[PDB]
Amino acid sequence: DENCGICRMAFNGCCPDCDDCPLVWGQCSHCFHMHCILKWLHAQQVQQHCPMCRQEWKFKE
């Protein structure tokens, strides 16, 4: 909708850790706060994938 899928907070506001809190996009076209997806990607012990749709992760842009 209009909320980050990871932190469930609005895109037009900060992530839970936040200040500059930019948004980023995956190839799967899901949007997250950069900080949120970075936290997720870091924790992953397997091939980086989207927390939402489990597609392989690539940053679009």
């Binding site: 190839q27 950069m34 900080h35 970075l38 990607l41 870091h42 992953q44 012990q45 397997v46 091939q47 980086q48 992760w57 690539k58 940053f59 679009k60 842009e61």
Partner: protein
């Protein structure tokens, strides 16, 4: 003087790189390409919550001995 840094790669494994503080981010991506095979223009590097920019050096980000970077892929183009 030289140092080792740690890089978490897209396949999930952490690798090490031998680098210098004066190395550019481009230099680092080149090293990563040798090891991981990812073309530099498809690499995105982060230190903590900072995206690292080509043209900058490791020292510019105060990246130090055993600092850990996150490596992710960029959509080509």
């Amino acid at each position: 003087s030289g140092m080792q840094i740690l890089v978490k790669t897209p396949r999930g494994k952490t690798i090490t790189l031998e680098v210098e503080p004066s190395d550019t981010i481009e230099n680092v991506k080149a090293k990563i390409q040798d090891k991981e095979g990812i073309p530099p223009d498809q690499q995105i590097l982060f230190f903590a919550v900072k995206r690292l920019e080509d043209g900058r050096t490791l020292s510019d980000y105060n990246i130090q001995k055993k600092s850990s970077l996150l490596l992710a892929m960029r959509v080509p183009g």
